[PDB]
Structure 1
Amino acid sequence: MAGERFPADFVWGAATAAYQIEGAVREDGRGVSIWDTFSHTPGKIADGTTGDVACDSYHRYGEDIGLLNALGMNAYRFSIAWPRIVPLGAGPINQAGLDHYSRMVDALLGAGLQPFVTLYHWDLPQPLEDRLGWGSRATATVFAEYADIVVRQLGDRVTHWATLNEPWCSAMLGYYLGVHAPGHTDLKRGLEASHNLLLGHGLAVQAMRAAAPQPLQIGIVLNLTPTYPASDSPEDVAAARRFDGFVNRWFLDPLAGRGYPQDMLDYYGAAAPQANPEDLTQIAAPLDWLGVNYYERMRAVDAPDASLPQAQRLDDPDLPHTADREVYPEGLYDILLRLHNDYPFRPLYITQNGCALHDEIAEDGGIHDGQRQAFFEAHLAQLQRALAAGVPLKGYFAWSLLDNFEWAMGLSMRYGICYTNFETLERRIKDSGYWLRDFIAGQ
């Protein structure tokens, strides 16, 4: 109650991504994505799984709606699969794909769930990757075309759109570190990809407003990792700044109209992209909102012998960990205060926040994920502190609605507020999901 109340119009949702949940990978005209190629490459996924079935949400999105409704949410953040809309990436449209999402949008609106659509959550059409993917400027152009196509048919009903989800991931995990699709391992390729992602974003924003049948609220979604030096030594502070630049400022600064950060430009040297002024203008399209995805902090020590950005994580054995990450709720406060004071974007949404645990169905049938309840409660407490500081936060989306295909970790790593039995496709609300239900209902 006191100190726990969000605005009455606050957006409360959960979030997913198409490849992680949909399955039906060859159905209804869908093309091949880089994640189909990657997950079907031996050894890329930890457990031998693919997204071929996943949660079967292409067919079972109505069950997903049932969960959202049972949780008392008022919004659902999901992605549209470009392979279902333009199966060749650049080519004809697939009306069956558009019609599927049209039906889903209508189902959401009929349930009182505002759709928050992500256009690109990592499932680049493989034919585009065969032509260098995000390494090619042309991919940016045809992304904007895709964005146009989708807004023309859904923009009478969906006001809130994001272009990209987490370009750092797509660029640096996909092209530099090789852990995500398409799996390249070259810094220059990653940096070029980052630029073409940003350019695609900016071109898409402009294409979408031109194509819009009503005013839209268009954003981008960034993962941000607040970074802290492990000591105040020059070496460790510099390591923190490089990591901060690598993940955060590289994207935030050009979106803000500030160009690429010059420290990072000079650091990247020959690997840095040719960033002409006209591209940067386009990249800095005004945003109606910015989405923040937050999981963890980085406490950095200098790592001179490591790959760029020469910064290694120093885990704090004080702090608890989940199945895969350190828990640090106060980082969310810090990064939001940073955005509020230091950058121009507003309003803000938390578009993903959640955690993975070794969730199990208990003897009674529930999932007793108390650490995840505590994760949500602690992060939401930080959001109330941020709101009290004036941060213009307008909503929160729990990551994820349901356990899903967790990229290179496969089905093994459970992030849901609902448990997914991947054999039967049954979903079950976890205790943390019931806590969110009851917390939101108190609003």
Structure 2
Amino acid sequence: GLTRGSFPEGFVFGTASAAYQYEGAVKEDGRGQTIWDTFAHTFGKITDFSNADVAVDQYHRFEEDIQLMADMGMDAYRFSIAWSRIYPNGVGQVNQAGIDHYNKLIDALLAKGIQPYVTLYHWDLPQALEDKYKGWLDRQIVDDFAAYAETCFREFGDRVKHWITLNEPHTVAIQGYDAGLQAPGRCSVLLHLYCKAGNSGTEPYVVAHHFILAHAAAASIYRTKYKATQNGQLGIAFDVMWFEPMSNTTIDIEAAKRAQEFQLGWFADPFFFGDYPATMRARVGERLPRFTADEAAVVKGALDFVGINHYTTYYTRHNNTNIIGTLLNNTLADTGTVSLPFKNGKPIGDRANSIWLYIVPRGMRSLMNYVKERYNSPPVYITENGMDDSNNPFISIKDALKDSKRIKYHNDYLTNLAASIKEDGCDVRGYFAWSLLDNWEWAAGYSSRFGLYFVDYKDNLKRYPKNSVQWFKALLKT
């Protein structure tokens, strides 16, 4: 069985959270409105009609939750800073209460021996910036994000040594601006009637470009002003499905590779090579922004580590858009691929609660090797891995705690991860389970339970340990 000894000395184990999904206290201590407050309070946007006004109240309950982490022997905790608690209006007046709050959280974690891994941007853009210039659509976001980042380096970098600037820019660009399923909800209305405005063919690429420049601008500030004295490191958490060819044909083998370049490469190729993947330049053409030479020089090498958010593996086949019909540009169409968890009607694996989450442990090992090979062995952290139970009102809490499926999931994915390190020479430095606590799963609301701890929403957010808590405790025992 797995032990700490199955991993390199110093390997970091943690759990992960995000501010909007956990904190609650949305109108407390000067917090400004975000695009997700707006989204959650708009008809049609959240499948279970819920919101995160309270969520799991980690804003007030963080000391309890820190104890729940320590109970397993966790080394670290990934949490995000809500930009709107620091600058309620995105720019302008600093909110001292926001600083005081995250200082309390950081100090409390460190006092328990738990290292903070801090995400600066986990999707909760101040609504003021959405109103001011449509947020990520405007180049101004780059300097505004970088200034916010700098304030965080200044206030917290004496203690915080591990920073994730952005969580899943791919998810944001696609879900926020192509599908319009996540905030701010924008898409080609001809493609999805529920959207109020947007353009699925152009906006995702603009947003992605701005994310890339925003990271680079924050990284330049960090390296020039803070890194020498603070001695920390900066990365990004990329959402990454593994892709296998739907058939053993070179066309589908190439399609799987291309799907990867459009998902991870879209961001990582700029950070490692200074430009977008050639396949994107070829297929997206003039809708794909170009870096200037000075921009490429700040973007290339801007990561200290690669955060990988990984859950699942799909099959990919080559796809041609219908030659007949009016073309409505969108990101999937641009890839020249279709990726699905089915081959000949047979699923690639068992599925968790989430309709997208298929259980394919080997994908973890394949992906680690891919990253090592393509990017010349950068340090990698698994910044998210886990699975969800349903929220089932027809079973007892006691039965809800019996998460043997999650135990098997973590076991199998970690076994693959350990092999990628020991056998394959992949430089993986740590692993964070999604998630500490059941929480608000964005548009899925409270219908999805990802936690190691069960949260009783019908009994003042009481935390109960699922069986996986004991499993992690045993694993991490020293």
The residue aligned with 1:367 is 401
Matched, 1:150 2:155: no
Aligned to 2:220, the other structure's residue is in SS state helix
Unaligned stretches of 5+ residues in structure 2? 188-199, 322-331
What secondary structure, in the 3-state scheme, does the structure 2 residue paired with 1:420 have? Answer: strand
What is the CA-CA distance between 1:318 and the residue it aligns to? 5.6
Partner of 1:387 in structure 2? 421
Please report how far the alpha carbon of residue 43 of structure 1 lies from its aligned counterpart in structure 2 after TM superposition.
Answer: 0.6
1:311 aligns with 2:311: no
Distance 1:314 1:259 in 2: 30
Give the secondary structure class of the aligned counterpart of 2:14. strand
Query: Structure 1 pair 83/22, CA: closer, same or farther in 2 (3 Å)?
Result: same
- Aligned equivalents of 2:398 and 2:258: distance in 1? 49
What is the aligned partner in structure 1 of residue 474 from structure 2?
Answer: 438
Which one of 383, 403, 428 corresponds to residue 464 of structure 2? 428
Residue in 1 that maps onto 2:72: 71
1:41, CA displacement in angstroms? 0.9
Which of 339, 351, 372 matches 1:340? 372
Query: For the Cα contact (< 8 Å) 2:83–2:120, is it kept in 1?
Result: yes
State the Cα RMSD in Å: 1.8
- Cα gap change, 1:242/1:129 in structure 2, threshold over 3 Å: closer, same or farther? farther
- The reply on whether 1:216 has 2:232 as its aligned counterpart is yes
Contact 2:341 2:348 in 1 (8 A): no
**1:301/1:314 contact within 8 Å kept:** no
**Separation in 2, partners of 1:366, 1:197:** 39
Q: Equivalent residue of 2:183, what SS? A: coil
For residues 312 and 225 of structure 1, what CA distance do their matches in structure 2 show? 10
Q: Distance in 2 between matches of 1:432 and 1:176?
A: 36
Partner of 2:273, secondary structure, is: coil
Q: Does 1:200 align with 2:235?
A: no
Shift of 1:434: 1.6
Q: Which amino acid aligns with 1:313?
A: L
In the alignment, is the contact (CA less than 8 A) between 1:254 and 1:280 conserved in 2? yes
TM-score, length-scaled by structure 1: 0.95
Residue equivalent to 1:298? 314
User: What does the per-residue CA deviation read over 1:57-109, in whole Å, with 9 as the maximum and x for residues that have no partner?
Assistant: 11111121111011110110100000101111122211110110001000000
Q: How does 1:6-405 map to 2 (within 5 A)?
A: 6-130=7-131, 131-185=133-187, 186-212=200-226, 213-233=229-249, 235-305=251-321, 307-309=333-335, 310-315=337-342, 316-317=346-347, 319-324=349-354, 325-344=357-376, 346-358=378-390, 362=396, 364=398, 367-388=401-422, 389-405=424-440
1:117, distance to aligned residue in structure 2 (A): 0.5
What is the distance in 2 between the residues matched to 1:239 and 1:6? Answer: 33
**In the aligned structure 2, how far is the partner of 1:23 from the partner of 1:300?**
39
Note the C-alpha offset of 1:173. 1.2
Letter in 2 for 1:279: E
Deviation at 1:257, TM superposition (A): 2.1
Scaled by the length of structure 2, the TM-score of the pair is 0.88
CA distance in 2: counterparts of 1:426 and 1:211, whole angstroms: 43
Q: Which runs of 5+ in 1 are unaligned?
A: none
Tell me, what secondary structure is at the counterpart of 1:28? coil
Shift of 1:359: 5.7
- Say if 2:40 and 2:46, in contact at 8 Å, map to a contact too: yes
Amino acid at match of 1:339: V
Q: Give me the whole-angstrom Cα distance separating, in 2, the residues matched to 1:77 and 1:355.
A: 17
Tell me whether 357-366 or 68-77 shows the greater mean CA deviation. 357-366
Q: Is the 8 A contact 1:370 1:432 kept in 2?
A: yes
1:176 is displaced (CA, Å) by 1.5
* One-letter amino acid of the counterpart of residue 193, structure 1: V
Contact preservation (8 Å) 2:141, 2:214 = yes
Task: Quote the sequence identity (%).
Answer: 40
One-letter code of the match for 2:403? D
The residue matched to 2:6 in structure 1 has which SS?
A: coil
Alignment coverage as a number of residue pairs: 442
Structure-2 separation of matches of 1:220 and 1:435: 29
Tell me which amino acid in the other structure corresponds to 2:371.
Answer: L
